Amino acid sequence: RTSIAVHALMGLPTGGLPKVDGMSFTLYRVNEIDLTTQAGWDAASKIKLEELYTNGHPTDKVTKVATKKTEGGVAKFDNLTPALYLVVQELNGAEAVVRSQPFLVAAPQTNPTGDGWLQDVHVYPKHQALSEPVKTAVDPDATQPGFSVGENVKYRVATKIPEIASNTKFEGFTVADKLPAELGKPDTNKITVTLGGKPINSTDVSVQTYQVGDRTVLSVQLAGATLQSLDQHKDQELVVEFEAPVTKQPENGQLDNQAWVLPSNPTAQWDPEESGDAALRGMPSSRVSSKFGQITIEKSFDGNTPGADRTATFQLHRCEADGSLVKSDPPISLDGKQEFVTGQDGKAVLSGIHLGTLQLESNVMKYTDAWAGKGTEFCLVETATASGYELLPKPVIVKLEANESTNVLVEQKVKIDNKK
């Protein structure tokens, strides 16, 4: 009884590399090869790997034995019958990599010293790592700072093309992004794809969206000439950019996005944030988290609930440190509204204010305030009030801000009592 110990090495073959855990391998037995005979030994020497395995799947010429992941640098398939085996690295490892090709392993083998049989065989397939893509958010329109509800966000996903084993090809190359639920569908005229800062043969690039529950997945897949020559673009970036509408305030204030890179072109619509053991494992991007806030106005009229015949109107603005309006400061628009009227209960809710974004910059997570450089705070200006009441003469400062630690909705309640 024999064993095959698979050690998954990260690095480039030549023609002591680090062993990697969580690399997934399936062991198959090669049918009808008896290496103790000349019939079988010579059949083994004629074998074309494409006969045993082709198009990402085994043929009927092999029988599956088991599948497992490396741990402590090894996936050991123990208690094996003497046979010719085929070791297949799979796409469902703990981390996404450019996987090893299928390869044959006889068990037992002769000890390299010649001194007897080697029952416990070791093999050392090489794979190449995928770098974590860098996802950022950009405000695509500067008319209003940020991307509060009612405006569009833009995302940029930069993926490095790894150097792969000489004379091998990428199996495929997919970048997928399951947009957060608060976003609408991406504008198809604003999805762009560049490789090495160059546009790609659009015939080779398949841009698709599909719904998975209440979220849109955007998928960019390289195929054809472009995929075939992608091994010549080592260390270049594939950059996907897109815009989408911010349609609602995240309930927890967090508008969070990640993308994923998969070195494969799945035939089924792939959800990169799918779960189980068989799931094709993508390499996740850096996270982007945009922070939102909400202002609630609680209006009273000489201490009373306003009721049916009293209402006030406010606009949201930015103010300088002295409480004065920023020069030429426009009213802030939220979900297409630019003023806010108090209800009979005195409430007015200003929701979906995008405050800023936490994203990777030079490999460090950094928060940027979307309103940086437009004053120092938000403020409310009362533009109308009830019959016989006096308007508030100055903006009402409202402290509403986020930072790198923000992980719930930022709120401020503003109690305002109107006076005769």
Q: Which is nearer to Ca ion, 151 or 377 (CB)?
A: 151
Question: Of 89-118, which residues contact Ca ion (CB under 5 A)?
Answer: none
Nearest residue to 60 (alpha-carbon basis) of 19, 94, 81, 29: 29
The C-alpha torsion from 244 through 247 and 248 to 253, rounded to 10°, is 20
Residue span binding Ca ion (CB under 5 A) among the ranges 54-62, 106-114, 141-149, 259-267: 141-149
Find residue 10's DSSP bridge partners.
127
Q: Does 373 bind Ca ion (CB under 5 A)?
A: no
Q: What's the Cα-to-Cα distance from 104 to each of 69, 125, 299, rounded to whole Å? A: 18, 11, 77
Q: Does 141 bind Ca ion (CB under 5 A)?
A: yes
Least distance CB 142 / Ca ion (angstroms): 6
Instruction: In whole angstroms, give the CA distance from residue 182 to residue 99.
Output: 35
Cβ neighbours of 125 (radius 10 Å): 20
Instruction: In whole angstroms, give the CA distance from residue 236 to residue 233.
Output: 6
User: Which residue type sits at 122?
Assistant: H
Cβ neighbours of 328 (radius 10 Å): 5
Q: Quick one: which of 89, 136, 144, 254 contacts Ca ion (CB under 5 A)? A: 144
Residue span binding Ca ion (CB under 5 A) among the ranges 40-48, 132-140, 168-176, 277-285: 132-140
Q: Which is nearer to Ca ion, 150 or 282 (CB)?
A: 150
Q: Does 78 bind Ca ion (CB under 5 A)?
A: no
Q: Does 372 bind Ca ion (CB under 5 A)?
A: no
**DSSP, res 191:** -
> What's the farthest any 2 CA atoms get from each other in the chain?
108
Q: Is 114 assigned a ligand-binding role in the annotation?
A: no
Q: What is the CA radius of gyration of the chain?
A: 30
Q: Is 146 assigned a ligand-binding role in the annotation?
A: yes
Binders of Ca ion: how many residues, by CB under 5 A?
A: 4
Q: Which is nearer to Ca ion, 98 or 355 (CB)?
A: 355
Buried b or exposed e, range 145-155, using 16+ CB within 10 angstroms: bbbbbbbbbbb
Q: Quick one: which of 34, 95, 139, 298 contacts Ca ion (CB under 5 A)? A: 139
Q: Is 329 assigned a ligand-binding role in the annotation?
A: no
Q: Does 290 bind Ca ion (CB under 5 A)?
A: no
Q: Which is nearer to Ca ion, 89 or 315 (CB)?
A: 315
Residue span binding Ca ion (CB under 5 A) among the ranges 45-53, 150-158, 212-220, 351-359: 150-158
Q: Is 151 assigned a ligand-binding role in the annotation?
A: yes
Instruction: In whole angstroms, give the CA distance from residue 297 to residue 340.
Output: 9
Q: Does 335 bind Ca ion (CB under 5 A)?
A: no
Q: Does 256 bind Ca ion (CB under 5 A)?
A: no
Least distance CB 292 / Ca ion (angstroms): 14
Residues binding Ca ion (CB under 5 A): 139, 141, 144, 151
Residues annotated within a binding site for Ca(2+): 139, 141, 144, 146, 151
